[PDB]
Amino acid sequence: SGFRKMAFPSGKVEGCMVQVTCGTTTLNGLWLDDVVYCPRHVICTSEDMLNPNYEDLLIRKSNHNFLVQAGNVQLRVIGHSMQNCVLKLKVDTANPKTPKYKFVRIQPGQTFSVLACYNGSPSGVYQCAMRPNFTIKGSFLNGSCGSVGFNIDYDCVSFCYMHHMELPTGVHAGTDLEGNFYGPFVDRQTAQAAGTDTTITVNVLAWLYAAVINGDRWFLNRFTTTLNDFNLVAMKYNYEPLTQDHVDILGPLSAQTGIAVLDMCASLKELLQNGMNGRTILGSALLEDEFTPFDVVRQCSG
């Protein structure tokens, strides 16, 4: 029993973290095969962050401007190229600890684990979700740029996030491993702010199913709802619209508990209207939206 915000075992990503230094700036890099991936703003001064011309900054760099350090060993750079907002540094050594991996760009609502790192050294691991406004609610300090987010389905590491910045509201923005930012953000010190965030409705529903699985039923009721009537109510609580896709993905959790999706939607409607009256669901006094349907099935059945 029990239900926890659970991250993936981080060992496969730990063996990939290196330190990248350029000038006075040092951050983290991801060392896979003979390539080290890191945020391209490593080549920027503070003067440059307002309107950096990354092509012009990079052209003035040679390979030996980049110090890559893997634990105690210095890695020697033999090439460099820019792909969108990541720098790709070719090094003379393939990482002997390179796991089975792929790059995946994820959708809002998808979860993943973050390995926070400083100076190429892993500090901790925690579970995150891509918010609907394409930010993540992480825990990052200065020097954490280049830390990555990942899933491990079987023993293949699916890299989906690399940390680039913290926005004014204390949330975090970054790119996929192709260097494409999630959301409308840029690696540029502009007046950019996270859009108004919303609750991930399909995830709350999955987390309610998880409560029924672990033996809780107090929040159910005898009512049902149409999909559109539910969405009309939910968006008045800043909840994400629920789509038929979301209804389909919840199917297996509906079968395991015997509660139709729109019946659980009716229970979510009543919870939003009533609260919990001094009660808790799976140990929380708020409705949790950072567990996906997939996450619930992995932790409750295996």
Ligand X SMILES: OCc1csc2ccc(Cl)cc12
Tell me the chain's radius of gyration from C-alpha atoms.
22
Which residues participate in catalysis according to the annotation?
Answer: 41, 145
* Cβ within 8 Å of residue 131, ≥6 positions away: 108, 137, 171, 194, 197, 200
Which entry of Na ion, ligand X, a second copy, none binds 266, CB below 5 to 8 A by partner kind? Na ion
CA angle 77, 82, 86 (to 5 degrees): 95
**How many chain residues interact with Na ion (CB under 5 A)?**
4
Is 187 a binding residue for ligand X by CB under 6 A? The answer is: yes
Among residues 6, 35, 49, 249, the one that binds ligand X under rule CB under 6 A: 49
Looking up tokens 């965030």 gives: 197
In angstroms, rounded to a whole number, what is the distance separating the alpha carbons of residues 203 and 186?
A: 28
The closest alpha carbon to 26, from 68, 73, 84, 71, belongs to 68
In the complex, minimum distance from the CB of residue 232 to ligand X, in angstroms, rounded to a whole number: 38
Which entry of Na ion, a second copy, ligand X, none binds 221, CB below 5 to 8 A by partner kind? Na ion
Query: Among residue numbers 145 through 164, which ones bind ligand X (CB under 6 A)?
Result: 145, 164
Q: In the complex with ligand X, which residue's Cβ is closer, 47 or 245?
A: 47
**How many chain residues interact with ligand X (CB under 6 A)?**
8
Q: Which residues contact a second copy (rule: CB under 8 A)?
A: 1-12, 14-15, 115-119, 121-126, 128, 137-144, 166, 170-172, 214-215, 280, 283-286, 298-302
Is 165 a binding residue for ligand X by CB under 6 A? The answer is: yes
Which entry of Na ion, ligand X, a second copy, none binds 263, CB below 5 to 8 A by partner kind? Na ion
Looking up tokens 């990555």 gives: 148
Is 145 a binding residue for Na ion by CB under 5 A? The answer is: no
Is 221 a binding residue for Na ion by CB under 5 A? The answer is: yes
Q: Is 229 exposed, middle or buried (0-12, 13-18, 19+ CB in 10 A)?
A: middle
Longest CA–CA separation in the chain, Å: 69
In the DSSP assignment, the letter for residue 235 is G
In the complex, minimum distance from the CB of residue 223 to a second copy, in angstroms, rounded to a whole number: 25
The closest alpha carbon to 230, from 276, 264, 278, 189, belongs to 264
Residues lying near ligand X in the complex (CB under 6 A) are found at 41, 49, 145, 164-165, 187-189
Residues lying near Na ion in the complex (CB under 5 A) are found at 221, 223, 263, 266
